[PDB]
Amino acid sequence: LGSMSEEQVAQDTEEVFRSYVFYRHQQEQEAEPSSTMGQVGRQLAIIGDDINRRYDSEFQTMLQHLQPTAENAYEYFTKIATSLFESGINWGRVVALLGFGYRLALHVYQHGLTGFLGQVTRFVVDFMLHHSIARWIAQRGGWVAAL
Amino acid sequence: SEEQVAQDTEEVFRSYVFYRHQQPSSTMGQVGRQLAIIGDDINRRYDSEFQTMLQHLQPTAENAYEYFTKIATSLFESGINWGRVVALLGFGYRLALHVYQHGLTGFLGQVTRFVVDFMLHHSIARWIAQRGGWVAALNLGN
């Protein structure tokens, strides 16, 4: 009774991709399984890790020139995956899609740290300005007094 | 007078984080290096207890400013001194790295939705559905 629908694949993709990222990360960590969808992610994470150790270095460079930020990451991921399946779909290209999505995620995540530090820097500056901290420091001789 | 302190705060705080993580050709950068050495020592004794309080506070990138403001407000409500100011930098450094690290699973969830959203509208999920769904992936061998 019934058959695999699109939405059924979609809902499973969440659990599959989660397990894929968890075990991909786990293998990159040491290099320094309940549900059936979770096992599919583990099996794919094992395959994706072998494809990665072979072809990761070249994508590290290609990601540098792409310069994906948190803003255009979705834009770049969309048109890249579109060109991937334009001439057809197969399990191999699907596996490559997960490997690219995982790497593009971690890449944008790691390179976005300095951006987040700037926001926190504005939090510190914003607080000191209006809460008389800058007034106190300026009168105490400025920032040079710390030395 | 205040604005001069504000502008310098950006350069000082940058060098503070730069050397805290490490554990800079400017006079303000040297202030950050000096503060990073002291801030790291205080962080080696009382960090464990704040790890738990940060767990319950659950600061995210959205409400981080809101929580940082009233927390820092209560810090200086009873007065201001050089000691409390240094603690403010130590808290900002820890609050930054904490919200950043704990937001990874949050960022992965958003990326998970991009993939799912992509497969839905670009016939990828239908293609998988016709081959039997994701369970079919287990037949990849030889």
């Binding site: 020139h65 792409l66 048109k79 890249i80 399990w91 290209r93 596996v95 490559a96 | -």
Partner: peptide, 25 residues
């Protein structure tokens, strides 16, 4: 070339390579 095209060209090349040896007939 542009990174968008080279990346998609390599993913396609790597995926089809995987498919040609691990997608059973």
């Amino acid at each position: 070339m542009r990174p968008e095209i080279r990346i998609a060209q390599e993913l396609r090349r790597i995926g089809d390579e995987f498919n040609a040896t691990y997608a059973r007939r």
